[PDB]
Amino acid sequence: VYELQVQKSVTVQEGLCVLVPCSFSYPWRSWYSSPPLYVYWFRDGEIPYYAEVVATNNPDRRVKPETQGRFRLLGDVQKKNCSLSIGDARMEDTGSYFFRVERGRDVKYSYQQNKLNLEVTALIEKPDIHFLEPLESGRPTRLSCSLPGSCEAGPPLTFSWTGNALSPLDPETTRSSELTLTPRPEDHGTNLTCQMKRQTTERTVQLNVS
Ligand SMILES: CC(=O)N[C@H]1[C@H]([C@H](O)[C@H](O)CO)O[C@@](O[C@H]2[C@@H](O)[C@@H](CO)O[C@@H](O[C@H]3[C@H](O)[C@@H](O)[C@H](O)O[C@@H]3CO)[C@@H]2O)(C(=O)O)C[C@@H]1O
Numbered sequence: 079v080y081e082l083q084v085q086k087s088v089t090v091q092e093g094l095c096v097l098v099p100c101s102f103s104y105p106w107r108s109w110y111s112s113p114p115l116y117v118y119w120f121r122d123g124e125i126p127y128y129a130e131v132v133a134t135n136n137p138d139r140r141v142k143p144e145t146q147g148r149f150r151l152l153g154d155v156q157k158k159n160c161s162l163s164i165g166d167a168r169m170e171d172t173g174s175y176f177f178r179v180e181r182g183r184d185v186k187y188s189y190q191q192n193k194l195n196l197e198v199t200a201l202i203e204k205p206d207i208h209f210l211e212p213l214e215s216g217r218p219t220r221l222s223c224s225l226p227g228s229c230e231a232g233p234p235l236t237f238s239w240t241g242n243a244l245s246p247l248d249p250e251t252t253r254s255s256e257l258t259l260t261p262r263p264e265d266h267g268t269n270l271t272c273q274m275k276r277q278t279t280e281r282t283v284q285l286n287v288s
Pocket residue numbers: 124125126127186187188189190
């Protein structure tokens with residue numbers, strides 16, 4: 079009657095983030111005496127009684143400072159959902175984790191047979207630059223630099239574009255995610271680069287000003 083559905087292993091590039099679909103079941107006498115349902119996600123081998131959750135729906139249980147903000151229980155706990163959202167991954171998060179349910183004095187149980195093995199890899203993916211593809215001189219167009227599979231989980235990502243085609247403008251307006259520019263002819267073929275840090279990921283593109 080105590081079942082938990084979840085893929086056993088998971089992977090994420092450092093700094094990025096992933097969602098772990100999870101479902102769970104437990105016996106419920108189901109009558110009016112309906113006490114609160116509390117769920118926890120702990121690190122492997124920690125004792126429910128004395129550990130800080132990596133994630134929990136209990137508003138009294140303290141959460142591991144390291145996982146606060148990055149490990150969140152998506153979906154509805156009252157609806158078999160134990161899905162875990164893991165953001166701004168860290169090599170440190172690498173490890174095993176188990177899920178626990180507690181409801182009333184009767185329902186108490188750790189799903190020790192279904193641990194979640196999270197593995198954090200090194201960040202390879204580089205940012206992205208998007209636009210309409212006009213590339214006409216004397217015609218301003220905005221660019222959108224963004225990193226794939228990222229969450230607004232941890233500390234925001236700092237932008238900064240580099241290039242010779244940036245001189246014809248204010249060094250200030252060169253920190254946003256988006257950016258406009260009236261491309262010049264000397265900018266055509268220029269090497270522009272968008273950098274990102276969470277408070278070495280670069281994307282350098284040759285400008286095609288027609
Ligand atoms: C079965 C049920 O209705 N709920 C039990 C649960 C479940 O059997 C268990 O969660 C399934 O994984 O066990 C409860 O007691 C356990 C709990 O106190 C944990 C806390 O650490 O310890 C468990 O025993 C440990 C033992 O202390 C260790 O020395 C050993 O290395 O591992 C054991 C686990 O295999 C207790 O069984 C629970 O609430 O989790 C009591 C529920 O009634």
